[PDB]
Paper text:
The RNA genome sizes of LSV1 and LSV2 are ~5.6 kb, encoding three major genes: the Orf1 with the unclear function, RdRP responsible for viral RNA replication, and the capsid protein (CP) for the host recognition and viral capsid assembly. CP forms the capsid shell that protects genomes and is responsible for both host specificity and receptor binding to transport the viral genome into infected host cells, or for intracellular trafficking. We determine cryo-EM structures of T = 4 and T = 3 capsids of virus-like particles (VLPs) of Lake Sinai virus (LSV) 2 and delta-N48 LSV1, belonging to tetraviruses, at resolutions of 2.3–2.6 Å in various pH environments. Analyses of these capsid structures reveal the intermolecular interactions that drive subunits assembly into homo-trimeric capsomeres and eventually into a complete viral capsid in which specific domains, such as the N-terminal domain, the helical domain, and the β-barrel domain/C-arm, could encapsidate nucleic acids.
The models of T = 4 and T = 3 LSV2 VLPs were built and refined with the homo-trimeric subunits A/B/C or D/D/D. Each icosahedral asymmetric unit (iASU) of the T = 4 particle consists of four subunits A, B, C, and D, whereas one iASU of the T = 3 particle comprises A, B, and C subunits with the C/C dimer taking up a position similar to the C/D dimer of T = 4 particles. Accordingly, the T = 4 LSV2 VLP is an icosahedral symmetrical sphere consisting of 240 copies of the 57-kDa full-length CP with 80 apparent trimeric spikes on the VLP surface, whereas the T = 3 LSV2 VLP is composed of 180 copies with 60 trimeric spikes. Besides the overall differences in VLP diameters and CP numbers, the local difference in T = 4 and T = 3 architectures is that the icosahedral 2-fold (I2) axes in T = 4 particles exist between subunits B, C, and D in two sets in the quasi six-fold (Q6) arrangement but I2 axes in T = 3 particles are present along the C/C homo-dimeric capsomeres. As a result, the T = 4 and T = 3 particle sizes of LSV2 VLP are variable, with diameters ranging from 494 to 482 Å and 450 to 438 Å, respectively, from alkaline (pH 8.5) to acidic (pH 6.5) conditions. In comparison to the expanded T = 4 and T = 3 particles at the neutral or basic pH condition, measurements of diameters of the shaped holes on the I5 and I2 axes of the unexpanded particles at pH 6.5 show that the minimum and maximum displacements were changed from ~5 to 4 Å and from ~22 to 15.5 Å, respectively. At a neutral or basic pH environment, homo-trimeric subunits A/B/C rotate along I5 axes; homo-trimeric subunits D/D/D raise around I2 axes, leading the iASU to pivot upward. In contrast, the basis of the quaternary change on the T = 4 and T = 3 particles at acidic pH is further flattened on the I2 and I3 axes, respectively, suggesting flattened hexameric capsomeres concomitantly result in a compact particle.
Numbering used by the authors:
A (entry chain C), B (entry chain A), C (entry chain B): 66 to 513
D (entry chain A), E (entry chain B): 417 to 513
F (entry chain A): 313 to 416
């Protein structure tokens, strides 16, 4: 009839993963009564303009050969460094490869992605170059942008030796800095559910064509193996790549965060469902689900055009992972950034495991199978009204917890004992104008 | 603690889409806080016995050639027109292609469907003929029945330029008429959840068989490519085609509607779940999931029979669409109808969009992110006791809303303020006998 | 505001299927308002050490030929009968093939399973032999263990003629006996959710290699059909076969049941979710989802290694069924059993159907569409704290129902009228030590 | 009703509600002798049936009666041809329903 | 606003809220004649607008008035060049916002 | 089109007939002098003309709509609605008694 302490702690870490108060770590409030190990991964990366030595090419040049460093086309990228740039991070729900960084010479019209599968995508300290025309880059081309993945190795090691898993919470912080007189820029951030699924695209086999005109060999096997089959199953994400542009996100989502670049960002990525069931580790090739080109049987056609129906283009990422379902996909855009910037990324991912016997996790188990429905209902109610992001320095929210959670816990059904906790009003997060008010109208000091 | 006005309006349009009071249009009560555009499509079609000029054939005759009109086999169909006929409409949850009409010379034993993929299925003003033996019809055969799809083009155009969608409500009205002294007939209607899914049937590749008996060419590539792979993914509907016959539906479902033909029908198709999450547009080839023929590994067998396990026959419809999940499939049967009938179909589909930037929908957005749990709980409670269909002239239900919704909104949990609203009793919808009573025992005037 | 009688009866049969009081049969408390037929299958099997006449071999020997009896290698299995043995039952959620029995000469390190698809798996009265090295057994090999499936034929016949189904409850009882002075042994039991899914593994096609060196035939079709496609869809179960060993289950699950062998066991397998929606019959080849061997694109690689990513080994079972989703998988281990034992298995499966018209079920329909949310919430709350198994003779629990259900029904939300029912404490099920206490601290008489 | 044979199909659809009632059987005896032989096809859900007719008649059997008087019972007139039909308590019926 | 043509795109985005109001139209007439022609680009979300200006003016039309007095209305002085701007109720405005 | 566009639109079975009291669209009804003129129905334009960047040579042929002359002259009552009905699916041997009342 009242929220427990464990449920409240879980709610606090789920809504504010990077909060200074969230020192202890607690599991999902369903009391699964299973030996579980809750792991907390905190990582920091100082990303800046990459040097030439950590910059590989994805074209057919590095096809069978391992990664090829740029053959001193780095002059063009220095030319980029002359002017202002744009920096995007895409936080897909992938467990490892927490975020994908991308550097552009100037703001793109849309989040384009290469059709051909890239060669050797690079973990963060290295990058991989893509051409201006949306194609893989070989040496002697026109560089279009740089891309890299931020990889957590310990997450891989632990997901290896685990019977099941579920991601408890994840937050990303973006402490931004630049030399004085070069702080100009804007930061935009937005979350949105991009629910992927295990799908297989429709492909075609190759018909065999043999002409036996041997004197006694005249079989003439001309059979058509050119039928339609299914490619290997891949986890496809329906991220609206054509609408990941900054203005699109701003006008489409009203919880979208906007500020000057120096404020950084802080995205506590949130769920999109009520329940968080355990899942077995299941790494799969990730792909981004593009737009279809052949309508096919969307219009009156014959059987000959039955097969080539509405087949969407699939962009292979050449990256394999098991994703956390039902979590939002986040994305920011640091547009108009000085080239000699410095971004301190700080990611905190806390997630639960069912340890495998004899594995490492078996020595760090925790038996606190607490049950709580009030906390889950409150999480459902808040998910739909919490801001998408915050300034990087914004933590330890006074309204959070003793005020917001208490004021909202009275609403669920009539599971309420305290008559009234506190009236709740619509906040106004005008970070650009310094006219920000919290959920109870109390003005916030933008300095803190 | 009380249902809002927006939640009540949504409930009203969800339960009574064709209601005269439902003039305003409102979105789903979850307050998604996303720019949304709610579109209302109202369409009217005067379907009657088709003339010869709008009647194409689906056999191999129209395989590569476009649609072939019937080569004056129309004499047999006139022979149909001599006697009474039967008319079925199948309202699958497909977004476009709202319903599928079908004309039979006499009542079929079951909803048979052709095994071979038909050639050029026809939008409504045209029809396509199928043979009596359940096969595609070429000219010079025995016509078995006529089939057509009712297509909404604006729905296609809007679903093209939309990031996400969800179907808010859908209703179909069947105003029936016939010349005086020819009103004889019966109408049956029934809804039932036929939850389709993206599945791929198991098919076989073609083994290559080459006999190199050339003097120096003697490789003899005899490798068996005859392995088992997956066909292209299709959205399959498990509609019990063998049990879509009228009597089957009547005896199986107790909410099934029955009346004399002149009364028409009015089906407000209902959901089958609590939540209605947004989905990205995803047109796929629709198929109807038949019955399996080879048991395969359902019995002790070897590996040679491991592959050909329980593979069900799949009936390709040669029609592509993205379906609204979790909504019921409706079906009626106008049996014993005079051949020179006239049915005015009136479909109203209201559904929500997340507009794509620059698209048309972006100019017609609506920001009313209202939240309501009472309305959703009431919808869950009602879905399970609302009649499947109504007489065509039955609208503006007095019991609906101020009485039924109020009387039921007290039940959910104990989220109740008013002590008692009104006792609720089991209605008796005896439309044939003119002894109909509503949810509170008040007799209804069958005239209105 | 209070649990109904039908909801309470459903809860009782769901928690205690083999309870003597559960004579009447009741459906799921959601009031689906559909004609339903609830079927109860009670089966008894006296399993013992099989004789030579009912013992077939799974190797390539019985590949095209039907089952081959053992060619008097039965001497080795008699040698097994000299010493103590181990007996496992695996209760997967398969509707038919309720359990899978397995006999070992001595306790295995893990639940190994053959990589090659076995030949003709045997229904219970017959068994099938597997080699010691984890391979299929042909005559003249070293027998490793025996395996069989317990098959319910009536379930097959009824699932054939049914539009939809859902499994209401299932219980398995293990009355154990042995000659006097041979009762030594231990019994372990455990349930755990192993949520399977329809998956297709990634396989490769065979590239065609033709060398036309005919004088005029020099086409030289060398095209590579060796691409990557998807195998047929199979229902894969992620059962942690490497951790189905007894000690693993004991230390991993704290609700795991342990006792001396003579006590038998009684597993009321439980759900893992709140809702139990109807599903259409959908038999599929079952498979057990092993462990992957090729990391593939889990590490930086090229496109040539993109395809062969993290592909897990799949163990085909050569058995087809449609499984009940969201139910736990149970497993016991009778370790250190005398060879001349005798186990009376008693399985009770009660499950709901939507009858097909004209089918047999249509004559045994039941219209009691009762609705109850309190019962479902109570079931959710109990699922997480009920013991996994019981001694075979333990039924008719006093704490169950009038005490446990009443004491717990006050917790859900504040849907509570009676102020306090009874305090609830943590039970201690120390069946080995005869110090067992129920949910209210009342000591239980191990004799009853 | 059936008594299922073991192993037969009926054995999976059994029902244990062995309720006993003599009042219902006596009422059935009393009604059998005064119920109309047939009805118009559309005539169902009789208002007089059950809460009225069965209650009004259940007081008669012997003196197995608790409620003093339920409702007076009169002879109905089923003149379906003439549209002058009256039920067991004189209430005119709408031939449409 | 549009009156959609049948079958056209607008037909899928219609809105039925035929609200009637004469007070709003009269207030619009009264304000049109005294509202400033333009504003600084950053000037939005006027505090005086709506709850204050519209309320204070809605009492004037005829005597269609329930609230006795809302707020006295004075002539504003929009001296944007000199940073001496005052709104319709004399409250100085911060030129920064 | 009329049914879905107008919510005050009347629909019924044919036997019910109809009764349209055509209404004004304005507040005032000032007197006007008789002024018969050729009536025409204003169709849809075909030549965009200066709706797009063009020269003077295409300045003249701007957005000129097709006009359908009715070859009928009258003076119309301004500000009154235009009514329209449709008796669809009528038996050929029907009989419609029109009764018009105009007071002016």
């Amino acid at each position: 009839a009242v929220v427990t302490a464990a449920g409240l702690a879980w709610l606090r870490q789920y809504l504010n993963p990077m909060g200074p108060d969230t020192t202890s770590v607690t599991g999902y409030p369903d009391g699964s009564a299973v030996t579980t190990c809750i792991a907390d991964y905190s990582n920091t990366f100082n990303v800046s303009f990459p040097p030439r030595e950590a910059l590989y090419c994805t074209g057919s040049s590095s096809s069978e050969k391992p990664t090829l460093v740029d053959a001193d086309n780095y002059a063009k990228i220095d030319k980029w460094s002359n002017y202002d740039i744009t920096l995007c991070v895409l936080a897909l729900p992938m467990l490892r490869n927490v975020v994908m960084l991308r550097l552009y010479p100037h703001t793109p019209t849309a989040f384009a992605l290469t059709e051909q599968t890239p060669n050797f995508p690079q973990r963060f300290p290295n990058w991989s170059v893509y051409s201006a025309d949306g194609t893989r880059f070989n040496n002697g081309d026109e560089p279009g942008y740089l891309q890299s993945y931020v990889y957590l190795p310990n997450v891989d090691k632990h997901l290896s030796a685990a019977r099941g898993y579920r991601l408890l919470s994840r937050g990303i912080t973006g402490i931004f800095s630049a030399p004085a007189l070069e702080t100009q820029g804007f930061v935009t951030a937005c979350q949105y559910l991009a629910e992927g699924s295990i799908q297989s695209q429709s492909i075609k086999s190759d018909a065999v064509r043999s002409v036996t005109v041997n004197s006694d060999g005249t079989v003439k096997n001309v059979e058509s193996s050119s039928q339609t089959v299914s490619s290997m199953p891949r986890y496809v994400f329906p991220l609206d790549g054509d609408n990941c542009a900054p203005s699109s996100l701003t006008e489409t989502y009203h919880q979208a965060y906007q500020s000057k670049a120096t404020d950084g960002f802080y995205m506590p990525v949130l769920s999109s469902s009520r329940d968080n069931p355990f899942h077995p580790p299941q790494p799969r090739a990730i792909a981004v689900y593009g737009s279809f080109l052949a309508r096919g049987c969307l219009d009156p056609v014959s059987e000959a055009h039955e097969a080539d129906g509405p087949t969407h283009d699939i962009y292979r990422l050449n990256v394999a992972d098991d994703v956390a379902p039902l979590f939002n996909t986040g994305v920011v855009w640091f547009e108009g950034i000085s080239p000699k910037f410095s971004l301190k990324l700080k990611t905190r991912t806390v997630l639960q495991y069912i340890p495998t016997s004899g594995s490492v996790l078996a020595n760090f188990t925790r038996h606190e199978p607490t049950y709580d429905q009030i906390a889950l209902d409150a999480a459902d109610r808040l998910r739909n009204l919490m801001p998408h992001a915050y300034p990087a320095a914004y933590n330890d929210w006074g309204w959070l917890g003793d005020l917001l959670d208490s004021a909202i816990s009275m609403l669920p059904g009539v599971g309420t004992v305290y008559n009234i906790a506190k009236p709740l009003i619509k906040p106004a997060w005008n970070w650009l104008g310094n006219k920000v008010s919290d959920f109870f109208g109390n003005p916030v000091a933008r300095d803190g």
